[PDB]
Amino acid sequence: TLSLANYLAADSAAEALRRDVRAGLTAAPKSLPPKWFYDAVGSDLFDQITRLPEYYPTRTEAQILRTRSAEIIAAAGADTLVELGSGTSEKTRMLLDAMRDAELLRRFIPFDVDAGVLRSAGAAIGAEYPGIEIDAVCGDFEEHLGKIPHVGRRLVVFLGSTIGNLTPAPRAEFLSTLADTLQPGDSLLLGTDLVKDTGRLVRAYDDAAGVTAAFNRNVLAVVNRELSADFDLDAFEHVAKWNSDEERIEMWLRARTAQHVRVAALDLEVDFAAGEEMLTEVSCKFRPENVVAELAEAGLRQTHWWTDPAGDFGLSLAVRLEHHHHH
Ligand SMILES: N[C@@H](Cc1c[nH]c[nH+]1)C(=O)O
């Protein structure tokens, strides 16, 4: 059966956007938070990104998952799959199938922000695996992970290398609060894209076909629609840079010419000097030794580690770290 629990107010999304755009456009370095890439148009564009020749990470992680699903499930020994975020639908089925193969499948707990996407995919998963207890949560990572049920022993999965779109401090902060939700006997499966040839890294985030560029520009179309703004989309160049100090890709929007921009709903006036760049995303790439470290710092011990043949991408399986104190 299905049980959906909706923790997002109707105006929670509207109000956070106002809040965010106002801070982003008035900061000395202008910026916009990546979460706003994912309206209907944006998210279809991202789905198209997962199929681009240059954009290896989705298909690499998918491929590892394919090989290791049986093994993950034997190691988790869980009857309950929690999926943090959705939009990794084919990957979900791999984990669900492997749980069924093992005669262990009992409960599915998707956790996303679109109640409609949840509501639908539940009827589809509920179709394919009859007899399953689906408990969808409409909630937000930074507030509502606590809302996720701790009944049974659970495999909690965070795929799509989303965790890389957070900078060190809020990334440590999210890993830690997430670690707190795990009961003894639960496991976290986490995906992390790895440091590699930087030319391949830059190309992955600025494809030949200009799709990423559209994806990037569309955040302005979002602001235009939702907050009555007049961003000239054609006036901003998509630029992807590799930051070797932070070992991350950064996406920017660079004004070709001097732009003056009005956000009417916010009664905000913004100016873009010619060539001025606006930060819209970072994508952090990990080193195998540091994943183990950031995990332990979060309160999690790696129990398993899997890479694709070319060492492009990592999957980790972790359990709550425990200590023996001395006084
Ligand atoms: N999670 C994806 C989001 C993205 C794709 N392209 C640009 N951003 C990544 O950082 O790889």
UniProtKB/Swiss-Prot annotation:
Keyword set, alphabetical order: Methyltransferase, S-adenosyl-L-methionine, Transferase
Effect caused by changing E281A: 130-fold reduction in catalytic efficiency. Dramatic change in substrate specificity since the tryptophan-specific activity is increased more than 2000-fold and the histidine-specific activity is reduced 3000-fold
Pathway, per record: Amino-acid biosynthesis; ergothioneine biosynthesis
Binding residues annotated for L-histidine, in chain numbering: Y55, N165, Y205, E281, V282, S283
Knockout mutant characteristics: Cells lacking this gene are unable to synthesize ergothioneine (ERG), but do not show growth defect. Deletion of egtD from wild-type M.smegmatis and a mycothiol (MSH)-deficient mutant does not affect their susceptibility to tested antibiotics. The ERG- and MSH-deficient double mutant is significantly more sensitive to peroxide than either of the single mutants lacking either ERG or MSH, suggesting that both thiols play a role in protecting M.smegmatis against oxidative stress and that ERG is able to partly compensate for the loss of MSH.
Catalysis: reaction(s): L-histidine + 3 S-adenosyl-L-methionine = hercynine + 3 S-adenosyl-L-homocysteine + 3 H(+)
E.C. number: 2.1.1.44
GO biological process, one term: methylation
InterPro entries: EgtD, EgtD_Actinobacteria, EgtD_Methyltrsf_superfamily, MeTrfase_dom, MeTrfase_EgtD-like, SAM-dependent_MTases_sf
Binding site for S-adenosyl-L-methionine: G85, K91, D112, D140, F141
Transferase in keyword set: yes
Any one Gene Ontology molecular-function term assigned to this protein's record: L-histidine N(alpha)-methyltransferase activity
Record note on domains: Consists of two distinct domains: a typical methyltransferase domain and a unique substrate binding domain.
PANTHER family on file: ERGOTHIONEINE BIOSYNTHESIS PROTEIN 1 (PTHR43397:SF1)
Stored HAMAP family: EgtD (MF_02037)
Function as written in the Swiss-Prot or TrEMBL entry: Catalyzes the SAM-dependent triple methylation of the alpha-amino group of histidine to form hercynine, a step in the biosynthesis pathway of ergothioneine. Among all the proteinogenic amino acids, only L-histidine is a substrate.
Family recorded in the similarity comment: Belongs to the methyltransferase superfamily. EgtD family.
Subunit structure: Monomer.
Designated name of the protein: Histidine N-alpha-methyltransferase
Organism whose genome encodes this protein: Mycolicibacterium smegmatis (strain ATCC 700084 / mc(2)155)
